[PDB]
Every structure is written in C-alpha cells, then in structure tokens.
Design a protein around this ligand. Sequence first.
Ligand SMILES: Nc1nc2c(c(=O)[nH]1)N[C@H]1C(S)=C(S)[C@@H](COP(=O)(O)OP(=O)(O)OC[C@H]3O[C@@H](n4cnc5c(=O)[nH]c(N)nc54)[C@H](O)[C@@H]3O)O[C@H]1N2
Ligand SMILES: Nc1nc2c(c(=O)[nH]1)N[C@H]1C(S)=C(S)[C@@H](COP(=O)(O)OP(=O)(O)OC[C@H]3O[C@@H](n4cnc5c(=O)[nH]c(N)nc54)[C@H](O)[C@@H]3O)O[C@H]1N2
Ligand SMILES: Oc1c(Cl)c(Cl)c(Cl)c(Cl)c1Cl
Ligand SMILES: Oc1c(Cl)c(Cl)c(Cl)c(Cl)c1Cl
Ligand code: SF4
Ligand code: SF4
Ligand code: SF4
Ligand code: SF4
Ligand code: SF4
Ligand code: SF4
Ligand code: SF4
Ligand code: SF4
Ligand code: SF4
Ligand SMILES: [Mo]
Lengths: 193, 193, 250, 250, 734
Amino acid sequence: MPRYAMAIDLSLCVGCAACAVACKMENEVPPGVFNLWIREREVGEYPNLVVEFRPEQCLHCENPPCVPVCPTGASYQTKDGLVLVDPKKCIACGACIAACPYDARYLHPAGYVSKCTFCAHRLEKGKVPACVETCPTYCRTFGDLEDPESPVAKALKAAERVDVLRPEQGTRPKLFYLNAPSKKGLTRESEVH
Amino acid sequence: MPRYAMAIDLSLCVGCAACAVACKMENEVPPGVFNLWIREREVGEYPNLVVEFRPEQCLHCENPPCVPVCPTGASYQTKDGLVLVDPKKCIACGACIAACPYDARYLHPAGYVSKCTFCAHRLEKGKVPACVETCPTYCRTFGDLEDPESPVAKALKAAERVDVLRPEQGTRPKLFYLNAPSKKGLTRESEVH
Amino acid sequence: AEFYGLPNAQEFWHWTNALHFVLVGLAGGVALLAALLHLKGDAEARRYTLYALMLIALDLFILWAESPARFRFTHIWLFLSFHPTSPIWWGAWGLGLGFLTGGLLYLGKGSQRALAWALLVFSLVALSYPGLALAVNLNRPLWNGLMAGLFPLTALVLALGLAALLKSPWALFPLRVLAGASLLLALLYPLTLPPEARGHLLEEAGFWYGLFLLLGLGTFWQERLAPWAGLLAAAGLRALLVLAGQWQGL
Amino acid sequence: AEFYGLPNAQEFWHWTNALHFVLVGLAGGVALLAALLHLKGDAEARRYTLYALMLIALDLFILWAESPARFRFTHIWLFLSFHPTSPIWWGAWGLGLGFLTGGLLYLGKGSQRALAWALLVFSLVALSYPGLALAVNLNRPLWNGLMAGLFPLTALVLALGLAALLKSPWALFPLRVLAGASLLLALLYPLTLPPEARGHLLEEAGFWYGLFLLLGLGTFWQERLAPWAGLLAAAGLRALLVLAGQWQGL
Amino acid sequence: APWYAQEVKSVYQICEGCFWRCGIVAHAVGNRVYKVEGYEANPKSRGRLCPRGQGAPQTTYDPDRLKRPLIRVEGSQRGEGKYRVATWEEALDHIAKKMLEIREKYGPEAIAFFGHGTGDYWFVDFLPAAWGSPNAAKPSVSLCTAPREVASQWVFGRPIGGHEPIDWENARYIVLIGHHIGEDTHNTQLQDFALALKNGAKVVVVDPRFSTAAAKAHRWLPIKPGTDTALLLAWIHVLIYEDLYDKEYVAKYTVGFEELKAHVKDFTPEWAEKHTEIPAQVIREVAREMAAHKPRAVLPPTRHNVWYGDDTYRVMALLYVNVLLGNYGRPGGFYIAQSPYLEKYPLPPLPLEPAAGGCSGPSGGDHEPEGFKPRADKGKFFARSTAIQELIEPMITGEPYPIKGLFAYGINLFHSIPNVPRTKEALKNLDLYVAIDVLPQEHVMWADVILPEATYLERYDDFVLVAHKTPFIQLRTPAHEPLFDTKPGWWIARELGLRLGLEQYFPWKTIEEYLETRLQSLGLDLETMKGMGTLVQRGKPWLEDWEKEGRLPFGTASGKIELYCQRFKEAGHQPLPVFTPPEEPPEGFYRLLYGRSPVHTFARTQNNWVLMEMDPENEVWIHKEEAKRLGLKEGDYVMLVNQDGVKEGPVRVKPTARIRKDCVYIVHGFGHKAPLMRLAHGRGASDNYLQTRYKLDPISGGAGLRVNFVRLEKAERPRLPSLTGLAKRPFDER
Ligand SMILES: Nc1nc2c(c(=O)[nH]1)N[C@H]1C(S)=C(S)[C@@H](COP(=O)(O)OP(=O)(O)OC[C@H]3O[C@@H](n4cnc5c(=O)[nH]c(N)nc54)[C@H](O)[C@@H]3O)O[C@H]1N2
Ligand SMILES: Nc1nc2c(c(=O)[nH]1)N[C@H]1C(S)=C(S)[C@@H](COP(=O)(O)OP(=O)(O)OC[C@H]3O[C@@H](n4cnc5c(=O)[nH]c(N)nc54)[C@H](O)[C@@H]3O)O[C@H]1N2
Ligand SMILES: Oc1c(Cl)c(Cl)c(Cl)c(Cl)c1Cl
Ligand SMILES: Oc1c(Cl)c(Cl)c(Cl)c(Cl)c1Cl
Ligand code: SF4
Ligand code: SF4
Ligand code: SF4
Ligand code: SF4
Ligand code: SF4
Ligand code: SF4
Ligand code: SF4
Ligand code: SF4
Ligand code: SF4
Ligand SMILES: [Mo]
C-alpha cells in the first residue's frame, strides 16, 4: 500500500564507495557481481569543470520491464513497489537481464538471477537499508513516497532538481537523483562521444 | 564561422504570444500554419502548482534529421548552423516533415515546404530576429554560441539549468530552454494522466 | 495541453499518397516478376515487362499529380543531384532507370540478360525504398524497423496476386508462401511496439487491421478468392500503416 | 566513465544460447513443413513429423543443458503458470504442445488432420517467439522491430535448407524464395538503426555480417552448394544478431 | 515578394491596440502596413511590443471592416439589420437635423455621448461640452477604474492615472491583488514586472485563481472571492499593532493616522482567516515580510476594480498599507507622475467645463442652480464621475428628464455595459442613435446612421500626453491614406461641429494646422515632431525634489490617512469597514470570474484572423474535482446559465486545477452575435451577456460585476465555419 523509494542527493555524493561496500557485506554479494556500483564522470574544461559521482543500482521501477518478460513468474512486483526474485521458480534464462535498461541484474553463481532487493529483509524488521545506514555524507534517503514525513518525501520536496536514468523508457524509476551537478542534467556517454 | 543559437528563459516567459505574432507578421506566414507557437501546461495540485509556458519552433538542430532525408537538395544546413530550404528545388514530398521530431515544418500554399528561418533575412543584414526584438519580458537571447560575449552565450553561462526537447533523438537542438519551472524538467504529454 | 497558435502536427501524407504506396508495391514487384521471367527465358517475360512499365508510369503520374509542386516543375532536381541518404531519392532512380531498362527489353535494343539483371537490381531498389521512407523516421514510433520488412513482402503479395488473376500458373504457390510470411509479420507487428504506440495503433486503427489480417487468410481457402483476399489484405495493410503512423506522440 | 565496482553489463546469452537460437529455428520450421505436409495429404508427412520431434527435443535438451538452473529443476514452473506477456513462456508451450501433438500424429492415433491444424498453430508460435524474445527489449537498440521479421523468415530458410538436402523435390524453390526475402531484409536492417547503433554493429560484427549476406547469395547458384550456402547464411545472421545486440548503449 | 525586400516607408505611430497607447514605427509598402515595431526612446514600448500591438494592423485590412456611411432604411426596426449606403454629406446632415430637433423640445442634455479610444477626446470630452450635454461617459470609469481613482483623489491629492506610477525597477517585494500580469498584457508593465523578477523581486499574488502572475510568485494566497478588504484590514492591523510601520513618514506626510489605529483594533489575522480563508500565520508573515523591505515593498493598485459593490473601500485600504510602508514618492514603488507641458489650442471656454473633484464639494454644486441640467446620474452615488451604466435608465423611463439620442464612439454597448437587455430597451426608445466604428459589431448594426472611422494607421490624432517619471508627448502620423469611404474622427467631429453652431470651436481648417499651433508653443513644428515621434520633458518623481522647493503634492497639504472629512459628515462612513461579507453562490452555481487573454483586446479583436488564429475561443475554468462530479471532461462543451436564466453559447470546458471550487472563470469578449464580423460570430461565451445584475458602488459610481453566479449545462460541440478558410479571404481595397 505505500510506494517505496530511494533518493540520492548528488550535490553531496563524493562517490567514496561506502554504500557499495556496505551492500556487499550485508547481502554477501559474491565476487564479480554488484547490487550497487558508483559511476564517476567529468564534464569538462577548466573554468567550467564538473564531476558527477553517481551511485547506480536497481531503481525498483514502477513499471518494470523485467517482470512481464519472465516465463516462470519468479520476477514479481510487490504491493509496495519492490521488484524481487523468488529463486525457487527462477530458470536462469536471462530474459529479465535483457529487459533491464540499467544493468542492475546478474546471474548468481548459485544458479538464479539476483540484484538489489531494497534490503527487503530489513524493511520487514522495520529497519532502513544498509547503504542508507552507512552513508557518511547523509546524501541518501528512503521511505514511502506517499507518507510526507518520509525521508524520501521530504528530500524530493527540498530538491532544487529531480532526475532519473533513461526516463524515455517505460519505467518510472523509483530511485531519484536529486541535485545533479551539471546544468544539462545527468551525464550520458553519447554527450561525450 | 559562428554557430547560431537561441536561448529562452522559461522563468521569465509568460506565454503572451508576442513573438508568435511578430513572426507571423514579419514573415507573412499564411493563415493555417505557424513557424512559432506557445504551449502551456500545468503540473500539480494545490501546494505545489507549477505552470510552464513554452514557445516552440525550429530548433535549428545541429544534427538535423530533416536534411539527409531530402531527395532533391532543397533542405540544407548552412556553415553557421542554420537549417533552411531552397524553394527552387523543393518538390513538396514531405519527407522533412516525416523526419522533424518537433512539428516545426509545414507545406506553404505556394507549393513548397516552410518553417522558421532564424530570420536569415535580418541576420544577413546585421539585425536580430523578429521574435527576439518584440518581447516584453526579455526572455529570448540569440547569437554565436562560440562568442563568449554574445547574448546566448551569456544567458547559458548564467542559467540555473539548461534543457532541450526530445534530447534522445540525436538532433542536438540549438534552441535552449533556461531555468525550467518544474523540478523534473520540461513537461511531456507522457507524464500526464 | 493549451496553445497559442498550434504545432504543425497534421497529416502530411494523405489517402492520395497511401494510394501511391499501394501502387509502387505493385509496380516494383511486377518489375521483379518481369526480370526473373526474362532470366528463366520464359515466354511471358514480354508482357510482364509491358505491365511493370505501365504500373511504373501510373505510379510516377500519380506521384506527380498529387505533388503540391506539380506545376512548379522542380522534380527535375530529383535527377540532377546525388542524395544517397534519402529513400525517396533511391526510389526515383530505381523506378526511373527500371523503366528505361524495361523499355529497351520491350524494344529488343541495348543488350538482354545484362538488361534483365539490371531490371532485377532496380526493381529491388523500388521494392525496398517505401519501407525505408517510413522507417528512417525514428521520431515516429509506429514506423519502426519492421516497416523495412512489411513493405517489401507486401509488394510481392500484390504483384503475385495480380499475376494469379491474369491466370499465370507459377505464382499461386509463391503467393501463398509470401502471403503467409506477410500475415505472420503483420500479426507480430503490434507486439513489437512500446505500450503507448500499440495502444495508439489499436485505438486509431486495428479493427481495420484485424479485418485485414482475417481477410488475407482467405488466400489459403477457395482457389479464385485467394488472389482478391491477398491483394486487399496487402493493400489495406500498406495504406493503414501509412495513415496511422504519422504520429510523434508522447 | 570511471567506476568503483562495475555495472552488470556483461554478455548474458553466450555462444550456447546462440546455438539454441539456430536450432529452434530449424525445430519450428520443420514442424511447419510437417503439418503442411500432413494437411496436404503428402506421403512424406510422416518422415518430416519424425524429425521435427527430434529437432524439437534436441533444442529442449540444449535449453536445459545450457541453463545454470538445470540441476535445481525449476523448469516445471514454465508449465505451471500463465504468463502470456513472455515470449519465452509462449515458446515453452509452443514447443511442448507442439511435441505432444506431433507424437499423437506419428503414433497415428488419438485423432488425425484436425491435429495437423493444431501442429500448424504450435509451429507458428515456435517460429514467432524467438525474434520477439529479442525485440521485446526496447532498451537494446539493435534488437529492433525487424527481429520479429528476420527470425521467422530465417527459421524457414533453415527448415527448407535441410529439406532440400534430404532431396525433397518441393523444397528448393520456396527455399530460394524465402532466402531472397531473408537476405533482402538482412541488407536493409543496418539502414534501419540509429547512426550510433549501426556504427556499433559495423565495428563489432559486419564483415561477419557482410560475409553471411554474400555467402547467402549462394542459394541462387548450383545444387548442393545452394542448400548449404543458404543454411550457413541463415544460421550466421541468427547467431550474430543474438551476440552483437546485447548492448544497451549510449 | 517578401514585404521587407520591397520598397518601404516608415512613420512614427501610436498603437490603438488598446489604451496603453505605445509609441510604434509602422512599416508600409504602398497602401499597407506589413510590420509595426516598438522604438527605444519611446518610454512605453522601448523597442518591444505585446501580441495585440503586433497584430493590430489587420483590422485595417479586414474584408468585413466598415467602408461607407450607412443610414437605417425608414420603417425598419433598430436591431433588424436594414441599411442603405449614404454620402458623408447626407449622413452628417441627417444627424445634425435630428440632433437639433431633440434640442428644441428637450434641451442639449437629452443627448448622451458614450465613447472610447484616442478620439474619445473629440466625442466624449470636447464635442459634448461644446454642445452642452453633461451626459458624456466612458466604460473605463464606472466599468473599470472609478473605485481606485476616487480612493486615490481622497487619500493623495492625485490620480493613479493611465500609466500607473510604480517604480518597479527598485521594488523588492510586490503584492498583487487580482492584478493579473502576463494575461493583462500592457506593454511596459510586462517589461517592468519581468525586470523586477529578474533582479530578485519576490512577488505575492492574492487571487482565487492561479493565474500567470501567480505562476511567477513566491506566494499564492487563494483568497475566498470578495473578501480582500478583510485581508487588507488585518495587514493594516499587523503593521500598526506590531509596530512595523514607517513612523517618520506618517509623522511628516499623513493626516488622521489615529482614527485608523482605533478602527482596526479587532480586525486581527484570526478575524481575517475566518472570512478570507487564508491561514492567520500566512496573513502575519506577509505583512512582516513587506515591513522588512520598506520603503521598497509595494501593493500596486490593480486597474479593473468594479468586482463587488464596495470597491472604493478595498482600494482605500490597499493605499493605507502603502502609506504605512512609506513608499509613496520614494524609490521602491511610487515615483510622482507629472503631466507634460503642451499648450492647448486657443479657444473660447466650453459651455460645460470639468470638475476633477476630490474635496470641499465636488458633487452637484454647479449642477443645482449653475445654469440648466445636471448629468442624469447625479444623485445615485457620492463621487462626481459620470457613470456610463447609470445614464441608460433615463432613456427607458424618462426618469431624471429624458435622454432621446445617443452617440457611441468606439465603445461596445453590448459587451462593455452590463444588462444587455436593458441597453436594447433603451436603444428602442431613442429618437437618434449614432455609432462611429470600424467593424460591423452587434451594437453598431442597431444604429440609425453608421459612420466608418479611419483606422489609427490611416489617421492623424491630437497628441497623446503621458504623466510619468519623465512626462512625454507622442504623435501619430498616417502611414497611408484612409481606405474606401473612410474618415478620421477629428474630421467627423469638426464636420458635425460646423453643422450645430460650433464654428468658434473647430476654427482651424485642418488637423496639421491644429498640430502646428501646439508645436509652436513648445519650440517645434510638424515636420520635426514627425522626426522624434515622442517628446520627453523634465519633471519630478520622489518627495525630495518637491520638498527642497518647499512644497508637497496632494489635495489639501498632508495625505489624510483615514482619508476624507466631507463624506464622513454627510454620507455616513469614513473608514473601509465594509469588508461586508459577500453574497454567496447558490448551490449548483459558481461565481463568474473573468479577465484577459494575452492576445485579444476586450471584444474588438475577435474578428482579427492573426489573433483569432492564436486564440479562437474562450475556455471555462472549473476545478478538476467539480468537472468530475458534474460529468465533464477535457474536450466537452457546455452552456453557462446565470441565476436569471440567461444562457451563453457553447464554451469549451477546462478541467485543470488553478481555481477554487467556488468559482468559474472565462476570458471577457467572446460570444459575439454579429454575423457580419464573419470570424468572431458564434465563438465562445460572452461574460457580459451573463452579467445581468451588478452591485452599484455607492461611493465611486462603479458597477460591481463579480456578483453574478453561473451554472454549467452539458452541450454539444459547436459546428462552425473554418477559421483558416475565412482568414484566407483576400483583402481588396476595391
Ligand atoms: N463585462 C465586462 N465589461 C467590461 C470589461 C470586462 O472585463 N467585462 N472590461 C471593462 C474595461 S476594464 C474597459 S477598460 C472597457 C473597455 O470597453 P470598450 O473599449 O468598449 O471595449 P471593446 O470591446 O474593445 O470595444 C471597442 C469598440 O470600439 C471599436 N473601435 C476600435 N478601434 C476603433 C477606432 O479607431 N475608431 C472607432 N470609431 N472605433 C473603434 C470596436 O469595433 C468596438 O466596437 O470595457 C469594460 N467593460
Ligand atoms: N491582453 C489584454 N490586456 C489588457 C486588456 C485587454 O483587453 N487585453 N485591457 C486592459 C485594461 S483596460 C484593464 S482594465 C486590465 C484588466 O486587468 P486587471 O486590471 O489586471 O484586472 P483584475 O480584475 O485585477 O484581475 C483579473 C484577475 O482578478 C481575479 N479576481 C476575481 N475576483 C477576485 C477577488 O475577489 N479577489 C482577488 N484578489 N482577485 C479576484 C480573477 O481571478 C483574475 O485572475 O487589463 C488591461 N490589459
Ligand atoms: O528459448 C529458451 C531459452 Cl532462450 C532459454 Cl535460455 C531457456 Cl532456459 C528456455 Cl527453457 C527456453 Cl525455451
Ligand atoms: O516514393 C516517392 C514519394 Cl513518397 C514521393 Cl512523395 C515523391 Cl514526390 C516521389 Cl518522387 C517518390 Cl519516388
Ligand atoms: S554513501 Fe553517498 S557518496 Fe558514498 S557511494 Fe553511497 S551515495 Fe555515493
Ligand atoms: S532468469 Fe529467472 S527471474 Fe529472470 S526471467 Fe528467467 S526465470 Fe525470470
Ligand atoms: S531497474 Fe531494471 S532490474 Fe531494476 S526493477 Fe527496473 S527494469 Fe527491473
Ligand atoms: S538497498 Fe540493500 S541491497 Fe540495495 S544497494 Fe542498499 S544495501 Fe544493497
Ligand atoms: S514574446 Fe516573450 S513572453 Fe511572449 S511568448 Fe515569446 S518568449 Fe514568451
Ligand atoms: S518537401 Fe521539399 S524540403 Fe522537404 S524533403 Fe521534400 S523536396 Fe526536400
Ligand atoms: S528543429 Fe526541425 S527544421 Fe530545425 S533542424 Fe530540427 S528537425 Fe530540422
Ligand atoms: S527567428 Fe525568424 S522564423 Fe524564428 S520565430 Fe523569429 S521571426 Fe519567426
Ligand atoms: S499595450 Fe500592446 S495592444 Fe496596447 S497599445 Fe501597447 S502594443 Fe498595442
Ligand atoms: Mo480597463
């Protein structure tokens, strides 16, 4: 009944990779694969140099292309907006990896697809995700989008600007980048070459 | 040698179609068609009500899809960045209309295709375009993008944010929108209902 | 939502053009039949060449009679320049040269197998350019890549459907193979679109679309309904995609 | 441009899932030959029905063999859930009901030639699903709408190529017709992509791409070159599009 | 082919697009103005122009534009549309003959003169007085500005004027009450408002509707309609009681500040929030923030003020807040506007001269024994201005004597005066009704004699003087000669003036003769005036410039803050307690709000193809949730029915939220029933045809319009001609 979301204030992100390492420890994510990673890009020339530190992970899209594509039904979207995988029905076919626009998904060495989970295991015991917990810069917030006392809700309200990766896709990403450092918005590789 | 562009401050635009009427008059654009129009869209409920006023017209794309697709060579891009039509070669096939992602062109009743000209007629004799001159609010700026002194260059340098329509086609528009009213950026019909 | 003035988002290609689209299909595909016939050395190669010439003439005549610049006489520029990136330019040269090539074939002058291979290549240019005249407009969500597949296969169902009404024995089998291909790709077409575009195709058309899909199934039933059904499905499908795909839409 | 950790942008369908793509082409294509040969009454309807059962079974083995989830036996769910939105789901049943149906037809029981109508339907589902399993991913620029057309055309080039090597009189001509349709759409494909997607395709594959296009031109020369040359072209293109399109790219 | 490559002739010319009268350059090629532009030196345009200014020239090249005089076929009813062409000579004789008859058995006061636009000087200010009728009026007085002009005359000794004196460029905090800037598209104030925003000017908008100006505001207060005086009184209370006001300023330039403090004792932000519906914290915060910025915090007074019957009180209160902030005459919001010096053309005094009243008896003293018959609306309200809407009754009942005969010089009888049925009864009963206009509107075709005026581009007009920081004088020169059988208003007035014994008035034989005399006075001639289109003179704007000279401006020597000892005495109340809870809409109904389209002027631009093509119809604004309970969606049409049963043609419904649930809003000027104006005929709903009733302001003659309620009834989409088809009719000067 709530709508779960994450917001990252890029004006404060320094791209130390604490959240990324906190995730790997908690969810014991295996070597070679990542639920969360950081992307750092410069937009250039001296008087006007800009560096964007951007953590990336499952955005738990509100209209996820990775769910419909699943033959088994292991890829499901929850009543509060988490996209999860039930490994019991997963046939490790990769259809969801093909349909995910963000590279958030991987094949776990135990034979099923995995990805960030919004720390489902903590959300039920009433705790905040591990990446949100460790953050030194206080730049990431979480909560129910519909509850206006939520740390995501209050941050979205305070942001000067709000962006999302590949909005042109169908998805409705529920991970919001707040104050993007470059005036043109979130950095893209086509805007370099 | 210059690279011609236009900048419109949306924080100042009030959608009084002055520019749209001035162009109609200056360029003798016949009745059922328009080189310039204003779109107005509201975003949101009671305590967060934003209204975006947006003039739309040829963006004189740097990578214009409306040029390669032309059979005759009527549709052409100038060395300074102007996209124009040599009516002497135009066969009114409508290929350029199919290819423009911005509804910027039309079939003029004289038998050829037309559209915003960046007032090439005034540019050549050292004047600024009709839309730019008649504008109570002073929200539009024009110039050579390469000259740090030109009014567009300055406007872009002083902007809080810069946006362009359908950036994901890869046309590289040369009509820049400054300081958009909504935190999420330029308004799209898809983010409605 | 509200405007002062209006964006120029109205239909630029009319019922008139959609007709040109059905015709150039016929034209091109009959020029392919005439080429392949001259190549087997079959006796019917002569009159199929007359027809491909007629349909080429009928198509250039309505391309010109429907042009807003029909009396400004600017089409000459189509032929005095080089625009390799433009489908319509390719189309003008394929048909045009394909009409000379097929002209000499008819008049037994300027060689004859070397002219039949030429007709073969120019008729592939003419069968190929329509789907690409649509498909290169990546801003129009309905004119996706399949248009480059749907248009060539459908131009063949038109030519073979015609050949079979004229009672040529070789064609009622290729007509069923190519009509099966066209109807399968036409049925999977909507499933290839982003949700909002499929929903737009279904609202604005479909019921017409779905009727053209059923229709074409009669190409596998009764012997003399088979070419009519195949002709009308292939032409209905071509015109419907041309009228319904002129949308930028968000 | 620089990362701490890495996006999971690694290839997800390897050379083994490119091999299955080629076999399900055959499996679905031959299952179509079989039902049509039934429906038509042909003496060969049996020979081809037991081939399609082997090709189908070979593929379903390669499908489980290459799955990292094999010894976890999770495939039973492929058959215990309803998931109409999923190309792969439709291919599990299309090849599963297509198997039973081909069994009840080879063991001459249950029912006759009302069952060849069901085999025809299931073979169309099996011919259609890969093509859409790629095209459904609108985030992959190379896997555009044409995949839904290039895969069914290419699966029949594979089935008719096999059929022609097992010297069936009927197979050569339709193989050279669908091979022409296949090769012409394959040529138009690059011209259908946006410039960055095409550039990616020509640097990653291409040669390989332009090789298999050239190679395929061999279906229109001699015999016992023909079925081979069209068969290597169809499987080249199929495997290369699965391999080169796993790009997300900006 | 393009006009700018073809030979051109420019001229300095005033825009008649609306009454702001911007200075413009007109570019003609032969007999046609292709382009018009603002110009730098001119203090109004400064190089820019609004949409209406840019499109204004097409009326001159409109195929339906009126060309010949016309006289009503004898025996045909006024309304029925039967006319026969006439000669200027014959039409002008017919009018004087008729006018003289009314004057021999009734007197000259039996002729009302209504008018608007530049040439209203001739028809409304000059001709009427030279003829002896006090029944001269314009809608910009009792249907617009009267409430604030009266409030201003009593509080300061000055007008607010046509170019309202706000020092926008130094303003730091601005409070707009119903003032919609960006929709109301007066050139210079758009420019200034935009420059204020630009320099970090934070703007507060009070309006029951989220307008364009609200779209640029730091705060939007969605006030319950007709409740602004309670919000103004509570702000007066916060600046006085929290002790935030400018102490010195009141001490040196203010009379009776004490009466105000005691009056406002109980009007607290909690008393206000109850009627206003704006939270009490917000009411407090807004007054504090404005006090923190003084003297550079301004509540500029809006122009259209007739809203409800109490109006002069709301403006008085708004002016007290400005006084309490110390901003009048200081850089921040009010500079002091002086009128330019251009000497009048020498003439005998006029039979009736005006009374620019404000104090010590400016009502009916000269109207009682003073010569022979007072303006016919003399006892209806306190103030002395003539009210257009009150002199209409005298034509139906013959009450205060009788008004047979009426002139309408460029004034929309059926769109600018409420209660259209009553106005039609009144035209029925008249002996003579003349209308001077350009297009065949619905009220021009009810006239005995229609006279076609020449348009602003084909005409010379007496100079335009503008009171300003730097007073200036503007001159308009023809861009080309009149078309068809068209004549300028100066010429039509003189021609009627010679026919009714007024030769001493109208002596000059030509307008350039007339213009050379006033230019002599200043030190120039006609050709030089044409050279520098506009003339700026030296004046004053602050209080220092006044003060150092040992003078102050006003009325009586110290702005009287409560504001007027002689109303108190014989009228009743001095202070603005009339917050007077407003009558509410009955259930099933909505209050009818109205306003401007950035691209259309009042009603007269609805046949303009360049402008109708930008905005072809109006659209009714209803809250999203109301249109939903009703069964209305985006593209639906609806009829508006008022509390009195009047229905207004099908209008498009506009279910997007930016409005309270109490209300509904439509742009004024659509709904024409005038078949001869082919592209304005049958489009949108007319607000005026729905404004059946009005609450008379008992202080400032104004007719409160926002007192009408309307309900929506589902209707069919309308079937109308194609606008492009009509817009394409070629213009032929025959
Ligand atoms: N119901 C309602 N009434 C209103 C208003 C409202 O919002 N609602 N607004 C009020 C206000 S604020 C004002 S200021 C007034 C304005 O009221 P008006 O000035 O009466 O308004 P318009 O509708 O422009 O009418 C102008 C008339 O003058 C004619 N005309 C235009 N140019 C010329 C010219 O050069 N010469 C001549 N002879 N005629 C010309 C036009 O054809 C038309 O007949 O109306 C007021 N009345
Ligand atoms: N484009 C264009 N511009 C013009 C004109 C034109 O014809 N066309 N005419 C000009 C003239 S002469 C005039 S008089 C003006 C008219 O324009 P204004 O002088 O600006 O008129 P207002 O009536 O103050 O403002 C209209 C706004 O008042 C609101 N309103 C209604 N009731 C209330 C209320 O009870 N309280 C509050 N706070 N607000 C309320 C409506 O919601 C609307 O948003 O514009 C002028 N400029
Ligand atoms: O077609 C299939 C593909 Cl591509 C994979 Cl990866 C799997 Cl596991 C299965 Cl079962 C089928 Cl049917
Ligand atoms: O295919 C064509 C189309 Cl669509 C047009 Cl509009 C024109 Cl003008 C020409 Cl010449 C050809 Cl070939
Ligand atoms: S903790 Fe914050 S700054 Fe560090 S990697 Fe995570 S998002 Fe970036
Ligand atoms: S890998 Fe697993 S979760 Fe992903 S689509 Fe296949 S079965 Fe579903
Ligand atoms: S980001 Fe990708 S993997 Fe995550 S929910 Fe969205 S589509 Fe699925
Ligand atoms: S929410 Fe949990 S699983 Fe997701 S990135 Fe944070 S710590 Fe990892
Ligand atoms: S003239 Fe200025 S305010 Fe008017 S539409 Fe153009 S940019 Fe906007
Ligand atoms: S319509 Fe004219 S400009 Fe456009 S592609 Fe055709 S010939 Fe070129
Ligand atoms: S805005 Fe239109 S005309 Fe201009 S370059 Fe882009 S597509 Fe071409
Ligand atoms: S720049 Fe030229 S074409 Fe563009 S709006 Fe202005 S006058 Fe029109
Ligand atoms: S404000 Fe606009 S319409 Fe009015 S006179 Fe000035 S330019 Fe003309
Ligand atoms: Mo007004």
